[PDB]
Amino acid sequence: TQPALLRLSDHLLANYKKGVRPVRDWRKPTTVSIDVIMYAILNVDEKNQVLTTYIWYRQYWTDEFLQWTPEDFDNVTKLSIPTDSIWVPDILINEFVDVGKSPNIPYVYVHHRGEVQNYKPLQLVTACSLDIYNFPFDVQNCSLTFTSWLHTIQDINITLWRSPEEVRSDKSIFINQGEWELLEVFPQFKEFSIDISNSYAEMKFYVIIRRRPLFYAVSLLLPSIFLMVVDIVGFCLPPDSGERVSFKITLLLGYSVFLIIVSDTLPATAIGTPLIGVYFVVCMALLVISLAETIFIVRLVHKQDLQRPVPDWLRHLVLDRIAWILVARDWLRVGYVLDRLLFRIYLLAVLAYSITLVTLWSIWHSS
Amino acid sequence: TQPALLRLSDHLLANYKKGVRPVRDWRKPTTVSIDVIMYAILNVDEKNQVLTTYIWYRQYWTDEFLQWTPEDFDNVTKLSIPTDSIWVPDILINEFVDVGKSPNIPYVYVHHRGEVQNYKPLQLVTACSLDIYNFPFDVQNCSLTFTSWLHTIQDINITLWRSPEEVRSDKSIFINQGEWELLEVFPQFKEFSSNSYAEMKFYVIIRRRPLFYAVSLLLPSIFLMVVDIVGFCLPPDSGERVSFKITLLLGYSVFLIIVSDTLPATAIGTPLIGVYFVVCMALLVISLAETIFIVRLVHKQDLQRPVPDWLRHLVLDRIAWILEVARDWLRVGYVLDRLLFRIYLLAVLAYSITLVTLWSIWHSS
Amino acid sequence: TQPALLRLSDHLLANYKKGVRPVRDWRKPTTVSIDVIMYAILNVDEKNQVLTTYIWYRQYWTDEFLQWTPEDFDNVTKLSIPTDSIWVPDILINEFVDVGKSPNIPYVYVHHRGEVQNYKPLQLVTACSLDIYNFPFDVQNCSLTFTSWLHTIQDINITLWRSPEEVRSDKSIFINQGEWELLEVFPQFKEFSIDISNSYAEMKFYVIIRRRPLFYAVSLLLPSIFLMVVDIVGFCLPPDSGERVSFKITLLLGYSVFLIIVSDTLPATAIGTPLIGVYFVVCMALLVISLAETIFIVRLVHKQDLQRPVPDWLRHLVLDRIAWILVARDWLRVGYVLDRLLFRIYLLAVLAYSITLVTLWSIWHSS
Amino acid sequence: LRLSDHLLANYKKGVRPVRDWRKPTTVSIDVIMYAILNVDEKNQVLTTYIWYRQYWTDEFLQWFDNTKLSIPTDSIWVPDILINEFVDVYVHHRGEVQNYKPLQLVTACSLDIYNFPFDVQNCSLTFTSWLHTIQDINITLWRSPEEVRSDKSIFINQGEWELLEVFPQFKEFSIDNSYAEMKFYVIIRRRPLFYAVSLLLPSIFLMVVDIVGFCLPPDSGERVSFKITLLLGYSVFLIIVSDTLPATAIGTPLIGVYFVVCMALLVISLAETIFIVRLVHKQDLQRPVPDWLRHLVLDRIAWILREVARDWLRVGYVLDRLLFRIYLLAVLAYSITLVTLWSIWHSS
């Protein structure tokens, strides 16, 4: 006689009709139980707002027609059935933009007295909402939403196979050496109602994804800190002596290309460029202002030029400046007090920058 | 005895066939209704002139063969039925080149009195005129049309499910803050052109956000141009300014490299501001070559002539009027350098004016 | 007559049923025999987490239902069958994160008496833990793991079809050229349990590779050596009062752009920066401190400041430490002392950099 | 429309059509080299958007409905022919069948990035029979072998790669048991203009200005400042180099050797200048030497083929002129290299 698996697959599928939701009493909902195990954050595309994540996804649902007794079929207990030959739930991720190159699992595993298991892995290209105002210390929160695309809550209800205390902190298979460290996966449930009684049934997972700053802390933050602290130090060179002008020249001449590549490598989104990114633009501004000062004072010392005009705006400006801070020689005094003002501006800017970085790190570590 | 949904699904399908329209009066059209809400614009690329989108496309119709009375079928008011078995209106999207990885739902709803709904997301790749010329401030206008593949209007009529007011204003799920703002979706509907399909066209109008490119491109550009302006006249011309000029040329070379990774190489060539990048590179190269040339003469000094006498007269009569022997070549070089500096300042002014104009047109949209 | 050739299909295909694992008794395991042959690594990318590989891959198993004899027609000994029609063990690469549009051969080839042979080009994307710290002379170790989902060890069992050492030695199809050179491939089998009281069955390979440090060496390692030498000369030979500042800031900018180059070459990683990169940070910090100290002490206090001493700390330090280990004139003298101190530690840093590069090359070549 | 149903009922999708067994069956192939897209230049893969065409007379069926049919061959058997290095990708009543499809072949090839950016590469596409093959398989080539296809192709794209000679040749192989294959060899130019303006022009300008640096007096601190700023120039230039040059098994392209040569020459030139600025009357410390090396240095002034301080100034002068001469020789060797590479690239 034919083997039990053939006779059983005949007994089950020879009159099975997929599409009909598998319940004898139609008015009873089916109940569907889902788990996601995160495996890898393959990307977080800030520009496109797409988190691409690889997960391991399992469904469990009870089907009253795939129901049979081992006693009549050589005591066989499980079977493997082609996935497209039984009903499967309508559960799609809402915030989803590409099926991805997921490896398909063509069979689903079925257990006597009517049970179904389906295990499949999804290279989700999700869609997500991302904040880069903190950078590189961003703590980012991304959501996965699972819903019956047509079936209302009277037909499909969505449930967590593991308790919420353990879907969180699962981080078991997770390849935790990527750029992004998985902090938690947190699950939340909502009966979305679209109108008076056609409430849908929806399940939510939130995936909290903290950047590991250390590479960016070395590459972006430490070079910028050194070039800023050395530029402030340059003020200690005597005002507009040959050293000062040459120093400011070469410093601008290298820092400008450093800033080109830095401003390339910072992410950007419509929400805004990173908070540290405004301080690099501020350093661009203060470099420009510095060199534009030196060209004025260099002409004063170098040429027989600015010594010939008087400073036609009131000397009131000078006593005002010194009152806040504390004719060629009058021009030189103006240059000196302007240089001291610019140094004060640099020191303020670098204090604000370091306080910002420590604030961002405190926030990131508080998470 | 029999489960209600099974005997119902059998009763529907047992006499069903896809070879006939969903209507018994074969002469009448089926009245399809359509709706679209745009979810995301994933890419626009000049390389293929294609627009890649994601849309929650919806179909609605009535099937005169799917009537049933729930009072018989155990009060089942509605059923889910596999899309392979039921007839589906063969709408073809035109201006269309791939359906992509659309996670299609295998079932459609049906109800008592046979009204049908079919929701499927589509990752449409459309094709469009990508005049990127205004980059990065470009406003683009991409037609996304729907057509009957063979049904003449007398067989299928295509309608919106809801007023253009909501189809235009229902941006409610658009995943904003990406590179492209969805400015609007505009429905328009005319004959597909005796037997013509009732074709329809929703015009996807999308506006690039410059703030992505502000720091990536615009601010480094302006910074480099101001750097060159400040550097042009600070060093004396004999003061080995060649070192500054060459190192900044390297910096403008390391910049243009970053700017070709960024700037779209569309079929018309690079966008407008690529012209001002090339102009600035050219003027910088010219200034460097001038500085190199004059340094040779000022160190050589044994040159057999103090000036290019034929040109010197015009240089004085016009260039200086608009704005041992090695000293005269130095004077000529100084006048040329002042000319080139003024040309650079004019070029940066023109670039800034065009940038503000592009912003003004983009914001007026 | 000749369409009777089609008999050899029709007699099987009308009776075959993909849903059943093709064994005489379901208590029998099903036994699957594998060869994997390797085609150039297309890239290592996302250098913190991801590997991409191209492979030529074999399955053989016995099918109890494709049983037939050549005498049924003209002694036809072998036949080709579409995989659309035959049961296939769903042996996935467990590390999958993407699967790739290889030709994906439609057909599978079967012997008389129901031996079954499957040959397919296959393209893999794989998640792996990367020794980025020893860059550039790296010897990555990457894993490929093979298991059927849902199928227990009692359903599916996996074995090499070659000898183990034959797989390790067989590189015949590997095209040799590229940034990465495959070293050795190691095959291993074990078991695991996760959602079963018994266990699954697991067969794993350990592809090894070592990127050719030719381009990375010349580009970053060589110029770096030259610049470090340029600083080794620029520390001693320029006078302490001289225009050292422009030199040191220029080489600081040098190291900053080497950090840029590495950061472009090498994306964000859990390990902060390659061992070599850490030395660029150390050199940059030494340059920053040396430039700041020289600027303040000589170029304020000697050239411009009055005869203002700070004796006790300076005198104490020189008499206790420097005099063992070795006004304005004394400021210049302690300037020279600090120069020698910074020169000695910087020379030691150059020695450490050389020792690391020779130690990195030693490890790489010995792989 | 109507006649297809009995045809697709009487013969199955998935089995090789033939009138009789043991008869080998023969397949004919055509390719248009449509739009080469991007050479990875990582000496590994060759992305292309070829257009591929197949004909075979052997679909077993022949012929209602009043001559051409086009039921898609998702319903009909298709020959096994595939590209070998194949990473990531109508019918007539006489019984002869026609299929056209476009393939985004990633391919694989042994690139020869040595003349960079004036590359010419010779690169392979192979079409081969692997399973379901038949022992006596034979493969057939449209248009006369190496005829009509060889030249005047459609040439759709030039955005980065030019493309040139496409040589068809056909071959049969036996592993013990025989396979039949067609071989297509395709030849492409890099477009050098972008790389020329973005890398070669900065490079040659650095050669020129560094040569100009030798016009400054050998003892002057102006040389120190100049050379320092040019060392910054090269430091930033290495960003250009490391971005632009692709990784390769050979290490670096031939152009990319002269970069490190000039870097080394500049670096050693700094030490010379720094020594001579040290060996100046106010700070030379009269640093003595045992004269023999000094005479063997000074006599090079003849053997080409304060007053005490002048000794070291003359040493500095001769070292300067020697280093200038070796720098000049490197500039000429570079220029001749560029002219040679350009001439080769233009002639092919």
Author numbering:
A (entry chain B), C (entry chain C): 8 to 333, 422 to 462
B (entry chain A): 8 to 200, 204 to 333, 421 to 462
D (entry chain D): 13 to 75, 80 to 82, 84 to 106, 116 to 202, 205 to 333, 420 to 462
From the manuscript:
We demonstrate that the pentameric ligand-gated serotonin 5-HT3A receptor (5-HT3AR) can assemble to tetrameric forms and report the structures of the tetramers in plasma membranes of cell-derived microvesicles and in membrane memetics using cryo-electron microscopy and tomography. We purified the full-length murine 5-HT3AR in a saposin lipoprotein-stabilized lipid bilayer and performed single particle cryo-EM, as we previously reported. The differences in the conformations were observed mostly in the extracellular domain (ECD): in the asymmetric tetramer, the ECD is organized similarly to the pentameric form of the receptor with one missing subunit, while the second conformation assembles as an apparent dimer of dimers. Both conformations showed tightly packed transmembrane domains (TMD) with a C4 symmetry between the membrane leaflets.
In the apo-dataset 60% of the particles represent an asymmetric tetramer and 40% the symmetric one while in the serotonin-bound dataset, the ratio was 53:47. The extracellular domain of the chains C and D of the asymmetric tetramer are displaced by 6–14 Å outwards from the receptor’s central axis, leaving a larger space between the extracellular domains of chains A and D. The transmembrane domains of the tetrameric conformations were less variable, with displacements of 1–4 Å. The analysis of FES suggested that the transition from a symmetric (6.4 kJ/mol) to an asymmetric tetramer (3.6 kJ/mol) is energetically possible and is likely to happen spontaneously (ΔG = −2.8 kJ/mol ≈ −0.67 kcal/mol). The reduction of the solvent-accessible area and of the gyration radius for the asymmetric state highlights that the asymmetric state is more compact than the symmetric one. From the manually picked thirty thousand particles, a subset of 4431 particles generated a density map resembling the asymmetric tetramer observed in our single-particle analysis at a resolution of 25.2 Å (H and EV4E). While few water molecules were observed close to both the intracellular and extracellular exits from the pore, the central ion pore region (corresponding to the residue L260) of both the symmetric and the asymmetric tetramers did not contain any water molecules during the whole long-time scaled MD simulations. This analysis suggests that the captured structures are not permeable to water and ions. Finally, a pentamer is formed by adding a monomer to the asymmetric tetramer.
